[PDB]
């Protein structure tokens, strides 16, 4: 200790490597119990009694307060997987931790970490190639039931699992509704434009898909109407309030006779703007800013529906969906103030609907584009939030399936096939990198193992049967259809998951593998740790 004068603690060698592996294992054991259709949810209490129910690994690792850096790495890994894919946040963490475990076992056996890293990189590349070449199914060959099956697969393990038969229909309809093609003629599916509202009350099956848009807002005055049929919609990015001269402008009166006209002008300016807006036929006025009572009275007398403090993103979406133009100002290229009816949007109805004890606004059947909103209905806010997270996962998955038209089977099929193929492929690459690739292959088996364990089944026997099927598939060209075999966790028996409908987007597995490999490599590269004492 004495020679090196650093003011901190120092771990070195097998000590710090084992410590890093312990941290990663801890993080993975936190989430292992929440993997697959037989995984279960977790409570999380935020030191104040704030409760969160969830199965989302990214959510869990965000809510946790982690202290070890090698575990913060896996937390960021789950976050990154959620950002780039939207599903696989638990599998990626489990796989990264298992890769770390086996790689540290090799380093203890004194295979050099560089060699382990080379072998892991090779196995990652070859696993990606083998997936893309042998394990993908075309969603064109499969149709729309492929999308429904992918959504149901994503919803299994969530609190909208068994209700998947109907939630998958909702998700698919919503993504197809928000489908839009842009310049370059490429089809784009911009999820996060589907609005998701939560409202405890009626059962899950009573959740609603709104052909149009749902706004978590209400009218500004109770004297205003709360339903309009041929809605002409005006989206404004400025406030409708009593006009005050700006900061660099002062009123200095030296003739009292001007005070009255100045004071009345301060309101007549906004009055004139509102009259100009209403003259075009606008019966619905959405605003990101505020609306004084003086203005709300104008809307009431006109029979219009005004909404204030609307959110910028909600406004952008309503505008795109209805055909309107968001105006930050009523100002044209002629130095005047006008409002054209072409800047208006349209909708077959705008209503304020009564959701159990609250109220919101529904914009139904907008033209110039179709939009989609979803009102989730559960037993309390905990249920509703978990439903929101599950539905976001499902929407991201369907988006990926529609963007890249390839899917892979689930239930550990891909992991079993990769284990077989890579344990056969390792024989060609070096002698120690061979061991590293074999360990990568064996690590990949942690997914079906965990699925079976959670299903309370003989993981050893089940994964052995799986590997037997996939080895038969890879050694007998007449039975290559066995690739599609995976776990049926409701019966503890392998099953053709391509015919059962257990599909996952290829991007899920590919990105999971790449990110897990990078995380394992970065953590495995560490052979020392200097922890400085805080000040």
């Amino acid at each position: 200790e004495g020679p090196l004068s650093v003011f901190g603690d120092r771990s070195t060698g097998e000590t710090i490597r084992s410590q890093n592996v312990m941290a990663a294992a801890s993080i993975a054991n936190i989430v292992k119990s929440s993997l697959g259709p037989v995984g279960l949810d977790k409570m999380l209490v935020d030191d104040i009694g704030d409760v969160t129910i969830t199965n989302d690994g990214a959510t869990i690792l965000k809510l946790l307060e982690v202290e070890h850096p090698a575990a913060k790495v896996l937390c960021e890994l789950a976050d990154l997987q959620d950002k780039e894919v939207g599903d696989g946040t638990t599998s990626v963490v489990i796989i990264a931790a298992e890769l770390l475990k086996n790689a540290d076992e090799l380093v203890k056996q004194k295979i050099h970490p560089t060699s382990v890293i080379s072998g892991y990189r090779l196995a990652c590349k070859e696993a990606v190639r083998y997936i893309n070449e042998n394990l993908i199914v075309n969603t064109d060959e499969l149709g729309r039931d492929c999308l429904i099956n992918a959504a149901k697969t994503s919803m299994s393990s969530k609190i909208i699992g068994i209700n998947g038969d109907f939630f998958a229909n909702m998700v698919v309809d919503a993504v197809l509704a928000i489908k839009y093609t842009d310049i370059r003629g490429q089809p784009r599916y911009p999820v996060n434009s589907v609005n998701i509202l939560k409202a405890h009350g009626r059962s899950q099956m009573e959740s609603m898909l709104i052909s149009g848009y749902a706004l978590n807002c209400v009218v500004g005055s109770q004297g205003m109407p709360k339903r309009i049929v041929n809605a002409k919609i005006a989206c404004l990015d400025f406030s409708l309030q009593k006009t005050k001269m700006k900061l660099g402008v002062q009123v200095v009166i030296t003739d009292p006779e001007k005070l009255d006209q100045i004071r009345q002008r301060e309101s007549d300016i906004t009055k004139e703007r509102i009259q100009k807006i209403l003259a075009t036929g606008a019966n619905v006025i959405l605003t990101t800013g505020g609306i004084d009572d003086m203005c709300l009275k104008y809307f009431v007398e006109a029979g219009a529906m005004a909404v204030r403090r609307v959110l910028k993103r909600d406004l952008k979406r309503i505008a795109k969906a209805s055909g309107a133009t968001i105006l930050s100002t009523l100002a044209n290229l002629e130095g005047e103030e006008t409002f054209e009816a072409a800047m208006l949007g349209q909708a077959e109805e705008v209503v304020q609907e009564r959701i159990c004890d609250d109220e919101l606004i529904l914009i139904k059947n907008t033209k110039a584009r179709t939009s989609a909103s979803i009102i989730l209905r559960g037993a309390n806010d905990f249920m509703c939030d978990e439903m929101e997270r599950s539905l976001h996962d499902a929407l991201c998955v369907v988006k990926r399936v529609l963007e890249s038209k390839s899917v892979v089977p689930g239930g550990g099929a891909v992991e079993a096939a990769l284990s077989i193929y890579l344990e056969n492929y390792a024989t060609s690459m070096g002698s120690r990198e061979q061991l590293a690739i074999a360990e990568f292959a064996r690590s990949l088996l942690v997914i079906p193992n965990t699925l079976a364990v959670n299903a309370a089944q003989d993981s050893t026997d089940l994964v052995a049967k799986l590997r037997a099927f996939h080895n038969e598939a890879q050694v007998n060209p007449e039975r290559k259809n066995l690739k599609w075999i995976g776990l049926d966790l409701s019966n503890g028996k392998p099953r053709d998951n391509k015919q059962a409908g257990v599909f996952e987007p290829t991007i899920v597995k590919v990105k999971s593998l790449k990110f897990a490999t990078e995380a394992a490599i970065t953590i495995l590269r560490i052979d020392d740790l200097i922890k400085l004492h805080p000040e």
């Binding site: 990154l80 400025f238 009123v251 100045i262 002008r265 290229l333 990078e518």
Partner: protein
Amino acid sequence: LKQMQVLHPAARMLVELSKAQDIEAGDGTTSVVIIAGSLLDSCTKLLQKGIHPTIISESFQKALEKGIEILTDMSRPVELSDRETLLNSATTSLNSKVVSQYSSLLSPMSVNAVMKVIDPATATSVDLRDIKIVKKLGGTIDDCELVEGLVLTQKVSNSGITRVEKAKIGLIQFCLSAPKTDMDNQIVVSDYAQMDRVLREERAYILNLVKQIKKTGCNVLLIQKSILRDALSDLALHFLNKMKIMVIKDIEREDIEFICKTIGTKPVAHIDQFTADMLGSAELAEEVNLNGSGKLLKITGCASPGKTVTIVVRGSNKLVIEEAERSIHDALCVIRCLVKKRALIAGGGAPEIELALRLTEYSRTLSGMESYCVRAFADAMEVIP
């Protein structure tokens, strides 16, 4: 060494030594510290033998001069046209770092970048501030990219206008907002008509500004960052968007020289001087999204691509991204060393071993008390292998 807060004076001095090596060569910051520690560990036994520190120092200077001779004799000349030699130098520099499975990707990039920011016939050095590195989370290190144009983290202010082809770009160091003299200014209203007049004249001022901008053919507008005054008022943004002009504000006063060097623009500080000759022509300007991991403005293609390049560093973790950046910097500094001194030496401890050997010979030839010190220098240099 800079990150571990060493406390002993000698350790601090070794930190400074490693920083000096990072400055002068950018590669070898570990070898230099190891060599220093070993030379001192040899001074241990020399002092014990009873040699004076001054004699040790002078004999070390002698051994240093002889070792410079030896290394120069070992060296072989190199032409910057030898792209394979440059690639091999970069791969050697990267072999030690976490980015070595991606060396196949980051060595050609590290050679292209440096070879793009220097005139290879006259250059005697390179300023690596001409090479911009942009760390963006997400993806993997195999997603690192060499952008020949310009990359900016600033967001686009227009909604709907993200892509521009045949882009004419202008830098605006003045503010598109209500006029404000450098002196204390007020606008005293005393009649109701003056209120409407004030609003109208403000609108007209802003509209005249944006019209003088549009008249040049400018469709991409980079606005410098302005404290003490609004550089882009809501009126100005409205008018620019209606005129179909992409707008990027909050450009930093330190990125201006870089952006100009990159896309041939000339910074304009008065609307009167904003003309077509002060613009930069780029074949494309796009706001690209990185798989929900952020956004980047890429100005690619340039009619005046003047000796500047950018490297986008991707990665799955903040830690691995930072180490990728550091390693790429090491590769660029290796290429910089090759540019400075057109000489190449083998690796794998060959120079250190040759040093040990030839300085052992030198010590046997320099009979005296300097012989012990030179032999110590040799056995100390034998520590890197």
